[PDB]
């Protein structure tokens, strides 16, 4: 199933944060819009946050993260987990090797904010 | 229902990270066997980090994420996924006030590291 | 924090499924715009699929689940879940005693049917 | 990744439970330690529980939903999710067809029961 595709509310602000667990660097690219709309990257084995930002859904809603070590896709998994029906978080792991830790990148989104 | 409350596995490394969505300044206590492991504060309104740090699980596994504001402790609300049954993450929201919008500082734990 | 609550989108068909793990007699009303649209009742200390009902969110897209046992309401526990950004949980246990299990009444809500 | 697998604590019972929507009849392999523990089938677009059954996690923990379609392998989704760090559920939808909905046959593992 496709991984690491979340339909937001449109026009909201919600913040997007990466950690890397990996030997290889990641390389986070966060679509919004089908346009790179935030990218970020590191190398750490200790949870390093090598990136955080707030963006803006736009008209669509759609957001959707990909992941990369040096050019090569990592396999993506994902859910969206809502608490008392108004905090939301929607949470991606990702692969990059073959021990399938699925920590390699870790992002998070969370929303709303303010 | 106790909230913000995790049992994780015993000696495991566990990334934790705060983020301030209040006017509020929010204290974030994580407690690891019932002593205090690590405290963060900060303020904002537009999601920023206000804290994050690698602790150690240690003997007890016991994890415990606690929030106050002006020495008040916020309501809480907690869950944890699991993701490809090997991706770990421990959710809290909290509410200072009376909107309930549960974002007032929101924690992130995540396992393993590494 | 309020639980049991969940907006489903308007007029969408739901399933919800209620189960049984204690010595009491459960009592599972779910409520769509605040008016009771199925109720199951019943004792199981092994999990018995105490009713299973196909609902309409409507109009509000409000649903609430609430868990009795004589006539006194159990404490709730709740979250949604959504997988591969389509597959919809809304998960729901309840504690009606001191052992703090929260399986006394579970209740699943699932959408989309068909 | 790997879908629709989850350790369980040893030795423990848990319920699993299976709901169709689709015109197909369902097939629903349930393993326990790679070994067959139940099977469901069944046909609806209404979310009918096509099976429900209370198993041993036995002395591998090791719990696996497949499910299949006229003999053919559907795509599975899965998750797990623990509220107040006492109820868990393992959460599985399947899709053997075009639409993307997940739900053909949907599965909800739980425990503990009693
Ligand atoms: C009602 C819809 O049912 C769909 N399933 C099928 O259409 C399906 C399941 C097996 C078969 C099937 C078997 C044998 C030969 C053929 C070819 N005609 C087909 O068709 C679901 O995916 C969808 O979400 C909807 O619930
Ligand atoms: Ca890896
Ligand atoms: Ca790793
Ligand atoms: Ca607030
Ligand atoms: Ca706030
Ligand atoms: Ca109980
Ligand atoms: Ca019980
Ligand atoms: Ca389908
Ligand atoms: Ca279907």
Redesign the interface.
Same mark, same amino acid.
């Given at each position: 199933? /496709? #991984?690491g &595709?979340? /339909?937001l509310p449109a026009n909201t602000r919600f !913040?997007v /944060?990466a950690?890397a %667990?990996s030997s290889g660097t990641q390389t986070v690219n966060v679509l919004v819009n089908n346009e790179t709309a935030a990218t970020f990257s590191g190398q750490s *084995? %200790? %949870?390093a +946050?090598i990136g /955080?930002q &707030?963006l803006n859904s736009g008209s669509s809603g759609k957001v959707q993260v990909q992941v990369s070590v040096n050019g090569r896709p990592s =396999? $993506? +998994?994902?859910? #969206? &987990?809502? @608490? *008392?029906?108004? $905090?939301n978080?929607a @949470?991606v !792991?990702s692969?990059d090797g073959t021990d %399938? =830790?699925?920590?390699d990148a +870790?992002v +998070?989104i969370?929303w709303? $904010?303010?």
């Open positions: 199933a /496709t #991984q &595709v979340f /339909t !913040g /944060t950690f %667990n *084995t %200790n %949870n +946050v /955080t &707030v =396999d $993506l +998994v994902s859910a #969206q &987990v809502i @608490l *008392t029906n108004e $905090l978080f @949470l !792991g692969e %399938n =830790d699925y920590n +870790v +998070v969370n709303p $904010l303010g």
